[PDB]
Design a protein around this ligand. Structure first.
Ligand SMILES: *[C@@H]1O[C@H](CO)[C@@H](O[C@@H]2O[C@H](CO)[C@@H](O)[C@H](O)[C@H]2NC(C)=O)[C@H](O)[C@H]1NC(C)=O
Ligand SMILES: [Br-]
Ligand SMILES: [Br-]
Ligand SMILES: [Br-]
Ligand SMILES: [Br-]
Ligand SMILES: [Br-]
Ligand SMILES: [Br-]
Ligand SMILES: [Br-]
Ligand SMILES: [Br-]
Ligand SMILES: [Br-]
Ligand SMILES: [Br-]
Ligand SMILES: [Br-]
Ligand SMILES: [Br-]
Ligand SMILES: [Br-]
Ligand SMILES: [Br-]
Ligand SMILES: [Ca+2]
Ligand SMILES: [Ca+2]
Lengths: 274, 5
């Protein structure tokens, strides 16, 4: 296991966003050409084991632990009736106090806030990716495709990401092999060597959230200088076409930086190898 | 898709 390995994301220009937005309120549009300098991206979401190394090293208490609760999806026992603030739910106890991570060390760490993620990545000699870096990486060298691998959800009849199958939120069939999270090295890599960049856990990025984007060409954009929510990308194991169609690289959502949930994790990036 | 705290 090398679940902290990074891959070189090549220098390039890509179309960020889309002129065919699927969720218009999220500012998926307009499409804009963005230039990204070569950098490194974690091949995997940060796993429980990797996060545990950080916590072992630093003694870090995550915000969910300090707050004493975090959001858990009702189906595994608010923004929606299916989100419950559960006392004692945190990265070590992802569905509450009588859940454990002992059997899922290689699954993505959850209930980590933006601050928690920044703490981890910086500890690791890394940083959060910007939204543009994240999306560029997600797209895996393809232009204007829905998903890291293309435009078909199940290419060649194969599941390519851990999302929801069935009727959300009542029934997750686990057709793709995972009802909750999957190991961080599950599913095929995209063209750049990234695993679970869409689906599995949502992923924090460094950007403040805005829905107002210029069509101006940009270089290594960092997002707006101010905001109240940070950008998260990629969807999760709860995502479905019918209500949270955000397992697309262009998709985007947000949360306040102190937010945590049972479907939200992260991966790091770095300008050079740490 | 995720509630804010
Ligand atoms: C985080 O630290 C804990 C506590 O030290 C580690 O678990 C112990 O590791 C020692 C040394 O190998 C073992 O002999 C013990 O059996 C473990 N004790 C407990 C309480 O589990 C744990 O391995 C560390 N985790 C990571 C990911 O590095
Ligand atoms: Br629009
Ligand atoms: Br459990
Ligand atoms: Br074990
Ligand atoms: Br595992
Ligand atoms: Br930090
Ligand atoms: Br950072
Ligand atoms: Br697109
Ligand atoms: Br395809
Ligand atoms: Br798999
Ligand atoms: Br321009
Ligand atoms: Br979701
Ligand atoms: Br904060
Ligand atoms: Br860096
Ligand atoms: Br939701
Ligand atoms: Ca699934
Ligand atoms: Ca993910």
């Amino acid at each position: 296991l090398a679940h902290s390995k990074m891959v070189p994301i090549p220098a390039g220009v890509f179309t960020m966003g889309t002129d065919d937005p699927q969720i218009k309120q999220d500012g998926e549009a307009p499409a804009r050409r963005v230039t990204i300098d070569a950098f490194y991206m974690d091949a995997y979401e940060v796993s429980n084991t990797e996060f545990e190394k950080f916590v072992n090293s630093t003694g870090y208490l995550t915000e969910a632990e300090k707050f004493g609760d975090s959001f858990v999806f009702e189906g595994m026992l608010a923004a929606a009736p299916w989100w419950l603030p559960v006392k004692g739910a945190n990265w070590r106890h992802p569905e509450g106090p009588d859940s454990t991570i002992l059997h899922r060390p290689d699954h993505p760490v959850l209930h980590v806030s933006w601050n928690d993620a920044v703490a981890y990545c910086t500890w690791a000699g890394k940083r959060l990716p910007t939204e543009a870096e994240w999306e560029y990486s997600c797209r895996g060298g393809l232009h204007n495709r829905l998903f890291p691998w293309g435009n078909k959800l199940q290419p060649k009849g194969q599941h390519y990401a851990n999302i929801w199958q069935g009727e959300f939120p009542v029934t997750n069939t686990g057709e793709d092999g995972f009802q909750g999270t999957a190991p961080v090295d599950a599913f095929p890599p995209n063209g750049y060597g990234l695993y679970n960049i869409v689906g599995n856990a949502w992923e924090w990025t460094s950007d403040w959230w805005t829905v107002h984007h210029s069509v101006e060409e940009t270089l290594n954009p960092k997002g707006p200088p101010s905001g109240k929510d940070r950008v998260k990308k990629g969807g999760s194991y709860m995502s479905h076409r019918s209500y949270c169609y955000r397992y697309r690289c262009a998709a985007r959502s947000q949360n306040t930086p102190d937010s945590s949930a049972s479907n939200l994790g992260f991966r790091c990036a770095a300008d050079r190898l740490p | 898709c995720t509630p804010s705290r």
